[PDB]
Tab-separated table of N, CA and C and ligand atoms in Angstrom:
chain	number	residue	atom	x	y	z
A	1	UNK	N	-146.785	95.868	17.996
A	1	UNK	CA	-147.318	95.079	19.133
A	1	UNK	C	-146.430	93.845	19.349
A	2	UNK	N	-146.181	93.552	20.618
A	2	UNK	CA	-145.446	92.363	20.965
A	2	UNK	C	-146.509	91.401	21.475
A	3	UNK	N	-146.704	90.313	20.757
A	3	UNK	CA	-147.690	89.299	21.147
A	3	UNK	C	-147.160	88.434	22.267
A	4	UNK	N	-148.088	87.950	23.107
A	4	UNK	CA	-147.853	86.775	23.912
A	4	UNK	C	-147.906	85.521	23.067
A	5	UNK	N	-147.274	84.457	23.529
A	5	UNK	CA	-147.256	83.229	22.786
A	5	UNK	C	-148.669	82.671	22.467
A	6	UNK	N	-149.508	82.494	23.503
A	6	UNK	CA	-150.857	82.008	23.251
A	6	UNK	C	-151.746	82.970	22.475
A	7	UNK	N	-151.572	84.261	22.706
A	7	UNK	CA	-152.332	85.268	22.005
A	7	UNK	C	-152.070	85.169	20.513
A	8	UNK	N	-150.812	84.978	20.171
A	8	UNK	CA	-150.444	84.835	18.772
A	8	UNK	C	-150.965	83.542	18.191
A	9	UNK	N	-150.803	82.451	18.924
A	9	UNK	CA	-151.372	81.213	18.481
A	9	UNK	C	-152.840	81.349	18.174
A	10	UNK	N	-153.608	81.999	19.030
A	10	UNK	CA	-155.046	82.189	18.749
A	10	UNK	C	-155.344	82.996	17.492
A	11	UNK	N	-154.636	84.092	17.339
A	11	UNK	CA	-154.705	84.933	16.178
A	11	UNK	C	-154.394	84.171	14.919
A	12	UNK	N	-153.291	83.407	14.942
A	12	UNK	CA	-152.972	82.616	13.768
A	12	UNK	C	-154.015	81.550	13.431
A	13	UNK	N	-154.581	80.924	14.459
A	13	UNK	CA	-155.593	79.919	14.270
A	13	UNK	C	-156.830	80.541	13.605
A	14	UNK	N	-157.198	81.724	14.094
A	14	UNK	CA	-158.386	82.372	13.596
A	14	UNK	C	-158.200	82.767	12.136
A	15	UNK	N	-156.937	83.046	11.756
A	15	UNK	CA	-156.597	83.425	10.383
A	15	UNK	C	-156.278	82.261	9.443
A	16	UNK	N	-156.485	81.037	9.909
A	16	UNK	CA	-156.446	79.838	9.071
A	16	UNK	C	-155.076	79.212	8.911
A	17	UNK	N	-154.150	79.529	9.810
A	17	UNK	CA	-152.822	78.963	9.682
A	17	UNK	C	-152.633	77.559	10.267
A	18	UNK	N	-153.488	77.102	11.182
A	18	UNK	CA	-153.301	75.785	11.780
A	18	UNK	C	-153.517	74.742	10.738
A	19	UNK	N	-152.459	73.968	10.516
A	19	UNK	CA	-152.368	73.012	9.472
A	19	UNK	C	-152.446	73.510	8.062
A	20	UNK	N	-152.184	74.802	7.853
A	20	UNK	CA	-152.130	75.325	6.502
A	20	UNK	C	-150.997	74.696	5.698
A	21	UNK	N	-151.355	74.055	4.579
A	21	UNK	CA	-150.402	73.216	3.814
A	21	UNK	C	-149.648	72.214	4.683
A	22	UNK	N	-150.341	71.703	5.687
A	22	UNK	CA	-149.848	70.698	6.586
A	22	UNK	C	-148.925	71.112	7.705
A	23	UNK	N	-148.733	72.406	7.891
A	23	UNK	CA	-147.930	72.902	9.023
A	23	UNK	C	-148.794	73.240	10.215
A	24	UNK	N	-148.608	72.440	11.258
A	24	UNK	CA	-149.366	72.613	12.494
A	24	UNK	C	-149.072	73.983	13.091
A	25	UNK	N	-150.006	74.486	13.905
A	25	UNK	CA	-149.834	75.797	14.507
A	25	UNK	C	-148.517	76.037	15.198
A	26	UNK	N	-147.993	75.059	15.943
A	26	UNK	CA	-146.749	75.261	16.646
A	26	UNK	C	-145.621	75.656	15.733
A	27	UNK	N	-145.667	75.153	14.499
A	27	UNK	CA	-144.642	75.570	13.499
A	27	UNK	C	-144.601	77.089	13.250
A	28	UNK	N	-145.771	77.635	13.048
A	28	UNK	CA	-145.943	79.074	12.799
A	28	UNK	C	-145.544	79.898	14.002
A	29	UNK	N	-145.919	79.455	15.208
A	29	UNK	CA	-145.557	80.180	16.416
A	29	UNK	C	-144.041	80.130	16.623
A	30	UNK	N	-143.436	78.958	16.421
A	30	UNK	CA	-142.015	78.804	16.552
A	30	UNK	C	-141.256	79.717	15.580
A	31	UNK	N	-141.749	79.792	14.351
A	31	UNK	CA	-141.086	80.627	13.311
A	31	UNK	C	-141.196	82.089	13.699
A	32	UNK	N	-142.351	82.510	14.218
A	32	UNK	CA	-142.534	83.914	14.655
A	32	UNK	C	-141.615	84.256	15.824
A	33	UNK	N	-141.500	83.345	16.772
A	33	UNK	CA	-140.620	83.583	17.930
A	33	UNK	C	-139.193	83.878	17.454
A	34	UNK	N	-138.650	83.042	16.603
A	34	UNK	CA	-137.313	83.240	16.213
A	34	UNK	C	-137.087	84.251	15.124
A	35	UNK	N	-138.090	84.510	14.321
A	35	UNK	CA	-137.947	85.555	13.312
A	35	UNK	C	-138.013	86.946	13.942
A	36	UNK	N	-138.940	87.176	14.881
A	36	UNK	CA	-139.301	88.535	15.293
A	36	UNK	C	-139.440	88.698	16.821
A	37	UNK	N	-139.267	87.615	17.566
A	37	UNK	CA	-139.552	87.595	19.003
A	37	UNK	C	-140.979	88.102	19.258
A	38	UNK	N	-141.874	87.756	18.348
A	38	UNK	CA	-143.317	88.062	18.385
A	38	UNK	C	-143.661	89.561	18.290
A	39	UNK	N	-142.744	90.341	17.734
A	39	UNK	CA	-142.897	91.785	17.577
A	39	UNK	C	-143.274	92.115	16.183
A	40	UNK	N	-144.479	92.657	15.989
A	40	UNK	CA	-144.937	92.976	14.652
A	40	UNK	C	-144.104	94.066	13.999
A	41	UNK	N	-143.389	94.859	14.785
A	41	UNK	CA	-142.604	95.998	14.212
A	41	UNK	C	-141.186	95.649	13.823
A	42	UNK	N	-140.778	94.392	13.977
A	42	UNK	CA	-139.449	93.975	13.636
A	42	UNK	C	-139.082	94.230	12.168
A	43	UNK	N	-137.916	94.775	11.971
A	43	UNK	CA	-137.325	94.934	10.630
A	43	UNK	C	-135.883	94.539	10.712
A	44	UNK	N	-135.379	93.971	9.624
A	44	UNK	CA	-133.959	93.665	9.563
A	44	UNK	C	-133.508	93.754	8.114
A	45	UNK	N	-132.367	94.420	7.898
A	45	UNK	CA	-131.819	94.655	6.558
A	45	UNK	C	-130.932	93.503	6.209
A	46	UNK	N	-130.976	93.107	4.942
A	46	UNK	CA	-130.162	91.995	4.448
A	46	UNK	C	-128.997	92.532	3.650
A	47	UNK	N	-127.967	91.696	3.517
A	47	UNK	CA	-126.760	92.044	2.768
A	47	UNK	C	-127.090	92.506	1.341
A	48	UNK	N	-128.071	91.874	0.698
A	48	UNK	CA	-128.444	92.235	-0.713
A	48	UNK	C	-129.197	93.557	-0.875
A	49	UNK	N	-129.457	94.226	0.245
A	49	UNK	CA	-130.233	95.435	0.263
A	49	UNK	C	-131.743	95.287	0.467
A	50	UNK	N	-132.240	94.059	0.536
A	50	UNK	CA	-133.650	93.871	0.773
A	50	UNK	C	-133.832	93.990	2.272
A	51	UNK	N	-135.081	94.064	2.711
A	51	UNK	CA	-135.357	94.154	4.172
A	51	UNK	C	-136.442	93.153	4.445
A	52	UNK	N	-136.408	92.593	5.658
A	52	UNK	CA	-137.416	91.669	6.165
A	52	UNK	C	-138.326	92.417	7.169
A	53	UNK	N	-139.643	92.199	7.053
A	53	UNK	CA	-140.616	92.958	7.806
A	53	UNK	C	-141.577	92.098	8.587
A	54	UNK	N	-141.758	92.463	9.834
A	54	UNK	CA	-142.913	92.052	10.581
A	54	UNK	C	-142.692	90.727	11.291
A	55	UNK	N	-143.783	90.216	11.805
A	55	UNK	CA	-143.758	89.107	12.704
A	55	UNK	C	-143.138	87.831	12.083
A	56	UNK	N	-143.304	87.696	10.789
A	56	UNK	CA	-142.727	86.597	10.044
A	56	UNK	C	-141.638	87.022	9.058
A	57	UNK	N	-141.125	88.240	9.215
A	57	UNK	CA	-139.890	88.616	8.549
A	57	UNK	C	-139.944	88.341	7.044
A	58	UNK	N	-140.966	88.911	6.451
A	58	UNK	CA	-141.231	88.765	4.999
A	58	UNK	C	-140.362	89.726	4.241
A	59	UNK	N	-139.683	89.211	3.183
A	59	UNK	CA	-138.621	89.914	2.500
A	59	UNK	C	-139.089	90.767	1.324
A	60	UNK	N	-138.482	91.936	1.149
A	60	UNK	CA	-138.911	92.881	0.124
A	60	UNK	C	-138.346	92.515	-1.260
A	61	UNK	N	-137.441	91.543	-1.333
A	61	UNK	CA	-136.859	91.163	-2.657
A	61	UNK	C	-137.942	90.503	-3.453
A	62	UNK	N	-138.812	89.749	-2.780
A	62	UNK	CA	-139.905	89.090	-3.486
A	62	UNK	C	-141.317	89.482	-3.191
A	63	UNK	N	-141.646	89.820	-1.948
A	63	UNK	CA	-143.009	89.701	-1.467
A	63	UNK	C	-143.784	90.982	-1.205
A	64	UNK	N	-143.078	92.085	-1.004
A	64	UNK	CA	-143.720	93.341	-0.721
A	64	UNK	C	-142.878	94.468	-1.306
A	65	UNK	N	-143.502	95.633	-1.423
A	65	UNK	CA	-142.837	96.784	-1.933
A	65	UNK	C	-142.479	97.786	-0.864
A	66	UNK	N	-141.190	98.072	-0.759
A	66	UNK	CA	-140.696	99.071	0.201
A	66	UNK	C	-140.082	100.296	-0.477
A	67	UNK	N	-140.128	100.324	-1.781
A	67	UNK	CA	-139.644	101.521	-2.521
A	67	UNK	C	-138.140	101.662	-2.549
A	68	UNK	N	-137.397	100.718	-1.948
A	68	UNK	CA	-135.961	100.763	-1.936
A	68	UNK	C	-135.234	99.453	-2.221
A	69	UNK	N	-135.881	98.523	-2.930
A	69	UNK	CA	-135.228	97.247	-3.209
A	69	UNK	C	-135.230	97.078	-4.733
A	70	UNK	N	-134.232	97.643	-5.406
A	70	UNK	CA	-134.242	97.614	-6.887
A	70	UNK	C	-134.406	96.262	-7.538
A	71	UNK	N	-135.258	96.185	-8.555
A	71	UNK	CA	-135.401	94.954	-9.321
A	71	UNK	C	-136.150	93.891	-8.548
A	72	UNK	N	-136.851	94.299	-7.488
A	72	UNK	CA	-137.573	93.362	-6.693
A	72	UNK	C	-139.004	93.185	-7.191
A	73	UNK	N	-139.635	92.126	-6.698
A	73	UNK	CA	-141.040	91.903	-6.959
A	73	UNK	C	-141.844	92.191	-5.684
A	74	UNK	N	-143.135	92.249	-5.884
A	74	UNK	CA	-144.124	92.495	-4.886
A	74	UNK	C	-145.206	91.440	-5.038
A	75	UNK	N	-144.852	90.197	-4.791
A	75	UNK	CA	-145.805	89.090	-5.040
A	75	UNK	C	-147.051	89.038	-4.173
A	76	UNK	N	-147.021	89.651	-2.971
A	76	UNK	CA	-148.218	89.748	-2.110
A	76	UNK	C	-149.037	91.000	-2.358
A	77	UNK	N	-148.481	91.861	-3.190
A	77	UNK	CA	-149.161	93.113	-3.640
A	77	UNK	C	-149.496	94.039	-2.504
A	78	UNK	N	-148.490	94.342	-1.666
A	78	UNK	CA	-148.714	95.134	-0.453
A	78	UNK	C	-147.478	95.948	-0.193
A	79	UNK	N	-147.649	97.115	0.378
A	79	UNK	CA	-146.483	97.813	0.906
A	79	UNK	C	-145.931	97.038	2.084
A	80	UNK	N	-144.635	96.999	2.168
A	80	UNK	CA	-143.998	96.263	3.288
A	80	UNK	C	-144.427	96.789	4.652
A	81	UNK	N	-144.689	98.081	4.737
A	81	UNK	CA	-145.189	98.618	5.977
A	81	UNK	C	-146.468	97.998	6.513
A	82	UNK	N	-147.347	97.512	5.638
A	82	UNK	CA	-148.551	96.813	6.076
A	82	UNK	C	-148.244	95.601	6.935
A	83	UNK	N	-147.075	95.047	6.737
A	83	UNK	CA	-146.606	93.885	7.509
A	83	UNK	C	-146.218	94.205	8.923
A	84	UNK	N	-146.189	95.480	9.310
A	84	UNK	CA	-145.761	95.882	10.637
A	84	UNK	C	-146.917	96.149	11.598
A	85	UNK	N	-148.129	95.974	11.086
A	85	UNK	CA	-149.344	96.342	11.771
A	85	UNK	C	-149.575	95.442	12.967
A	86	UNK	N	-150.286	95.948	13.994
A	86	UNK	CA	-150.702	95.100	15.104
A	86	UNK	C	-151.710	94.034	14.645
A	87	UNK	N	-152.379	94.319	13.537
A	87	UNK	CA	-153.305	93.398	12.871
A	87	UNK	C	-152.452	92.511	11.978
A	88	UNK	N	-152.364	91.217	12.288
A	88	UNK	CA	-151.471	90.332	11.509
A	88	UNK	C	-152.021	89.856	10.166
A	89	UNK	N	-153.238	90.267	9.815
A	89	UNK	CA	-153.894	89.737	8.605
A	89	UNK	C	-152.998	89.764	7.369
A	90	UNK	N	-152.397	90.900	7.066
A	90	UNK	CA	-151.574	90.974	5.858
A	90	UNK	C	-150.363	90.049	5.900
A	91	UNK	N	-149.746	89.907	7.070
A	91	UNK	CA	-148.587	88.999	7.212
A	91	UNK	C	-149.046	87.566	6.975
A	92	UNK	N	-150.178	87.216	7.551
A	92	UNK	CA	-150.675	85.831	7.441
A	92	UNK	C	-151.024	85.539	6.015
A	93	UNK	N	-151.787	86.443	5.383
A	93	UNK	CA	-152.182	86.243	3.995
A	93	UNK	C	-150.985	86.118	3.081
A	94	UNK	N	-149.944	86.903	3.316
A	94	UNK	CA	-148.729	86.782	2.504
A	94	UNK	C	-147.931	85.470	2.811
A	95	UNK	N	-147.851	85.120	4.089
A	95	UNK	CA	-147.205	83.877	4.493
A	95	UNK	C	-147.881	82.680	3.786
A	96	UNK	N	-149.194	82.735	3.607
A	96	UNK	CA	-149.880	81.600	2.920
A	96	UNK	C	-149.410	81.511	1.486
A	97	UNK	N	-149.161	82.653	0.855
A	97	UNK	CA	-148.585	82.623	-0.505
A	97	UNK	C	-147.142	82.068	-0.538
A	98	UNK	N	-146.343	82.484	0.428
A	98	UNK	CA	-144.970	82.067	0.509
A	98	UNK	C	-144.871	80.547	0.723
A	99	UNK	N	-145.653	80.008	1.669
A	99	UNK	CA	-145.509	78.604	2.077
A	99	UNK	C	-146.039	77.701	0.971
A	100	UNK	N	-146.827	78.289	0.065
A	100	UNK	CA	-147.342	77.541	-1.090
A	100	UNK	C	-146.421	77.586	-2.316
A	101	UNK	N	-145.242	78.207	-2.204
A	101	UNK	CA	-144.391	78.582	-3.354
A	101	UNK	C	-143.479	77.428	-3.858
A	102	UNK	N	-143.400	76.330	-3.117
A	102	UNK	CA	-142.538	75.213	-3.517
A	102	UNK	C	-141.754	74.603	-2.373
A	103	UNK	N	-141.191	75.471	-1.525
A	103	UNK	CA	-140.295	75.027	-0.452
A	103	UNK	C	-140.940	74.961	0.932
A	104	UNK	N	-142.242	75.162	1.026
A	104	UNK	CA	-142.932	74.966	2.281
A	104	UNK	C	-142.331	76.026	3.233
A	105	UNK	N	-142.176	75.647	4.473
A	105	UNK	CA	-141.700	76.588	5.513
A	105	UNK	C	-140.201	76.744	5.468
A	106	UNK	N	-139.527	75.961	4.650
A	106	UNK	CA	-138.089	76.094	4.480
A	106	UNK	C	-137.723	77.512	3.963
A	107	UNK	N	-138.705	78.227	3.465
A	107	UNK	CA	-138.531	79.634	3.049
A	107	UNK	C	-138.044	80.504	4.224
A	108	UNK	N	-138.407	80.135	5.455
A	108	UNK	CA	-138.029	80.830	6.681
A	108	UNK	C	-136.811	80.137	7.255
A	109	UNK	N	-135.663	80.815	7.126
A	109	UNK	CA	-134.411	80.207	7.497
A	109	UNK	C	-134.439	79.845	8.984
A	110	UNK	N	-135.053	80.684	9.814
A	110	UNK	CA	-135.104	80.418	11.251
A	110	UNK	C	-135.962	79.207	11.538
A	111	UNK	N	-137.026	79.022	10.757
A	111	UNK	CA	-137.819	77.768	10.908
A	111	UNK	C	-136.968	76.557	10.618
A	112	UNK	N	-136.228	76.593	9.506
A	112	UNK	CA	-135.459	75.438	9.123
A	112	UNK	C	-134.420	75.140	10.199
A	113	UNK	N	-133.796	76.186	10.716
A	113	UNK	CA	-132.639	75.984	11.607
A	113	UNK	C	-133.010	75.801	13.068
A	114	UNK	N	-134.182	76.253	13.493
A	114	UNK	CA	-134.519	76.258	14.946
A	114	UNK	C	-135.809	75.573	15.288
A	115	UNK	N	-136.667	75.323	14.296
A	115	UNK	CA	-137.964	74.717	14.569
A	115	UNK	C	-138.117	73.349	13.942
A	116	UNK	N	-137.693	73.238	12.690
A	116	UNK	CA	-137.853	72.014	11.942
A	116	UNK	C	-137.253	70.848	12.699
A	117	UNK	N	-138.038	69.813	12.841
A	117	UNK	CA	-137.567	68.564	13.478
A	117	UNK	C	-137.465	68.679	15.000
A	118	UNK	N	-138.132	69.673	15.568
A	118	UNK	CA	-138.195	69.854	17.030
A	118	UNK	C	-139.636	69.604	17.474
A	119	UNK	N	-139.864	69.554	18.779
A	119	UNK	CA	-141.215	69.363	19.312
A	119	UNK	C	-141.956	70.703	19.245
A	120	UNK	N	-142.556	71.013	18.095
A	120	UNK	CA	-143.082	72.385	17.935
A	120	UNK	C	-144.403	72.553	18.670
A	121	UNK	N	-145.054	71.421	18.968
A	121	UNK	CA	-146.304	71.450	19.718
A	121	UNK	C	-146.065	72.145	21.079
A	122	UNK	N	-144.819	72.186	21.560
A	122	UNK	CA	-144.467	72.870	22.806
A	122	UNK	C	-144.839	74.337	22.768
A	123	UNK	N	-144.822	74.927	21.564
A	123	UNK	CA	-145.122	76.357	21.431
A	123	UNK	C	-146.557	76.746	21.693
A	124	UNK	N	-147.470	75.788	21.645
A	124	UNK	CA	-148.869	76.055	21.913
A	124	UNK	C	-149.386	75.315	23.153
A	125	UNK	N	-148.523	74.633	23.864
A	125	UNK	CA	-148.947	73.885	25.075
A	125	UNK	C	-149.401	74.869	26.125
A	126	UNK	N	-150.506	74.519	26.786
A	126	UNK	CA	-151.074	75.385	27.789
A	126	UNK	C	-152.046	76.430	27.233
A	127	UNK	N	-152.050	76.686	25.917
A	127	UNK	CA	-152.931	77.735	25.403
A	127	UNK	C	-154.370	77.258	25.255
A	128	UNK	N	-155.292	78.160	25.520
A	128	UNK	CA	-156.676	77.897	25.181
A	128	UNK	C	-157.009	78.205	23.742
A	129	UNK	N	-157.174	77.163	22.935
A	129	UNK	CA	-157.372	77.311	21.506
A	129	UNK	C	-158.633	76.593	21.048
B	1	LIG	NA1	-140.256	94.412	-3.486
């Protein structure tokens, strides 16, 4: 599923992401835009052989099991395919584990490079929330 911007913002809000560990909703929407262009089916392979899955591009080296990333962990305890669902619950629940891991949203390279220190509230302007 390809979300609309406000539709995703609402979904994320309902799933407890607004201000989760102090990151306002616009942060999460901004990270999704640049990670996946709001497409839950997004996948991208990394140089190390791991793959990033879903709306927030969660990596198989640490967070999910895809059966093809040797020596990897599965810290969210989920098949990576669950991250591709039109239902974002598994992605959100795993993202909450990731953002709590030490480095905050800096874990998402696109957040650090394209969202951090920008007017992220712009991503939810106009939405009914
Ligand atoms: Na893994």
